Symmetry: D3
Subunit: 147 residues, 6 copies
């Protein structure tokens, strides 16, 4: 709740260029968990390398979608239960596409990584903790989709 400001202020920097920042998050994600790459299947084809995904307009569009859902979480940072229904169904989608629930922890690490690299000295441990708890709440809501 004091850290709701910490979320708000830190997100301001990154929301100004969501694709550039989102591309950091996804490049980091594939570096940590390369087995996620085949799950982005567009026009019946699999990306061979992570740099392949960055040439795909559909993949970059998904980066934008991801950033908009995080942006919705920031907007509702003070009460995330308003998004529970939407997030539950987003979890069910991703379950359908083949994402394991556990892969969302790597996503969280990739989000925290992108924030640390963007904010530098401004990524205080209280900012880390706040984002950890906001992201934790998002994934909690999403996890409902897996049962």
């Amino acid at each position: 709740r004091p850290e709701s400001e910490l979320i708000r202020q830190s997100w301001r920097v990154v929301s100004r260029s969501p694709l550039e920042h989102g591309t950091v998050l996804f490049a980091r994600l594939f570096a940590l968990e390369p087995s996620l790459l085949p799950l982005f299947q567009y026009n019946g084809r699999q990306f061979s390398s992570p740099e392949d995904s960055l040439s795909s307009p559909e993949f970059l569009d998904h980066i934008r979608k991801v950033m908009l859902v995080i942006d919705a979480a920031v907007t509702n940072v003070e009460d995330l239960s308003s998004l529970e229904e939407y997030l539950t169904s987003l979890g069910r989608k991703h379950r359908a596409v083949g994402v394991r629930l556990s892969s969302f922890s790597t996503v969280g690490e990739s989000l925290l990584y992108m924030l640390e690299k963007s904010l530098g000295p401004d990524f205080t441990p209280a900012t880390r903790t706040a984002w950890s708890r906001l992201y934790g709440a998002v994934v909690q809501a999403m996890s409902r989709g897996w049962d």
Copy 2:
């Protein structure tokens, strides 16, 4: 069932040189999930790098075994319950050797990858879907081995 032909016709190309095609599938598998490499323990030793596994006659023999089980699935594409018992026990084996059930999804992605690269324009989305469902059925049967 119409796609049983799609399975049959597409497999014809790859079954003519099963080791060459199987080597693609396994090179792709280790690229996506490097932590599978230590599970192939022959003569009490661990492969250091994926290219090490390709020099091992026992490892290449396992590639041939893998291709023969897929070949059996194609032969019984129209009724896979004939193989359920064999596949259940194959799952129990792999559980014993240390493979997590979830790793079989990466195997599926590696199989679809090898088929896409071998068939090129001939890997139609209906062919993708058919193989996804055949492979899904194989792993369903195998998953019984984990309980």
Copy 3:
């Protein structure tokens, strides 16, 4: 000269979002030649991983500079001797920063890679050849900087 049109038409697609396309080229470059990463030294620090470079405003600014020099080459596709002086000095710069001349061949491969992935079916072998020869001419001019 007929292929000067091939250059012009193919570049139109990519010049509309130069950073997005340039990010493909650089991600590919570091995947092929990871030893280039330490040469981008901003504020006395070295990037640890390729995804680190994508969070750096200075690094992304260099991507934009790269795309503008290629854009100048396209503008002068019909007579590149107008840029020889500028390109010679750009080569001398890069020599100073520690880039080996030979690394520019990997850059060429990364440029052709980004074009192939962006143009798909539109990247005809005549388009490949044209870009190979335009890029070859740019590097020829730049190579003067190394003596």
Copy 4:
């Protein structure tokens, strides 16, 4: 129990320089499962590359802690129930820090890898089996922490 000697004798070599050997185990671990790297969060920061973790005094200190817990397992090789309580709580810790139980299988593979490379011809299949069963017992005790 005869292999309790096999454990004892084989550990003697490695316990003389625990950090050097532990560094092998961890370099191998990150090579197999790169997604573990962000879990070592010291001073609110994430390591970008595995070589980053090797410059961290806190990370090297954790290597030493790891080796001391294995050393305790060797000391109690003949009766591991004396360590059950300590190990259960160590599991609960690691659960808290974000380690999935399943990641401990990769740790086991990394431990067996380091032992094979250190012992060479001396890593007999009976030595492999003994360490597999000792490590299996340690993780069994630790797994209690996850429920």
Copy 5:
């Protein structure tokens, strides 16, 4: 000359399945020098990942060609000057395709690697030395192509 037998006897094992062994050599080559991958340009396209090259009939055909040139070197192990002309022109080819002379040292390391993994205990240091000198002589002849 005594080691001409060492060459002959050691090559016998590998020449029985040249593609399988050649695939080890090339997988190792791309692992050491990933920047070689774009040089294999078939039908105007670049392989994204090393596992892509293993699905390409043209790439596997080149593996077979490579093994046949080494096989010719073994046949003329006692007098390599008979192949100088052929090898000089093979060097000129490869120069044309964009291979740097220096990359042939990595090839040598990949050849020695494949031999070590295939021969195991049979890869004696005298066998290593013999192959080093045979390969050195082949590349010496090839190096003429670069001037």
Copy 6:
């Protein structure tokens, strides 16, 4: 010369545990230039992966040798011509073992990387510059070995 103190003070931290710091430098080196790994040939065998080199007592011994030569450069920071003869012959050695002169630039980047990670805030750009120039002088002397 004022920066001779900058060299001296910064080296003090790292010389207290030369193997630990040297292991960072070499892990970084293989991450940037994997093709260097086969050049460390001990007992006629090639390391498959970088983590293999860290289990080798001979390889770790070479890390110690490397650190002692740098330590000699620091001791003679105020007049490096005293070491020219020794360094020239060290260059001739390395030429013999198969190291290309150009690979020593990657070594320099790996040394600067290890220093940055060890010194953190203490690695000022004047400290970077000083080490760049000291290392540059060492390699200049070594380069004599290549002609």
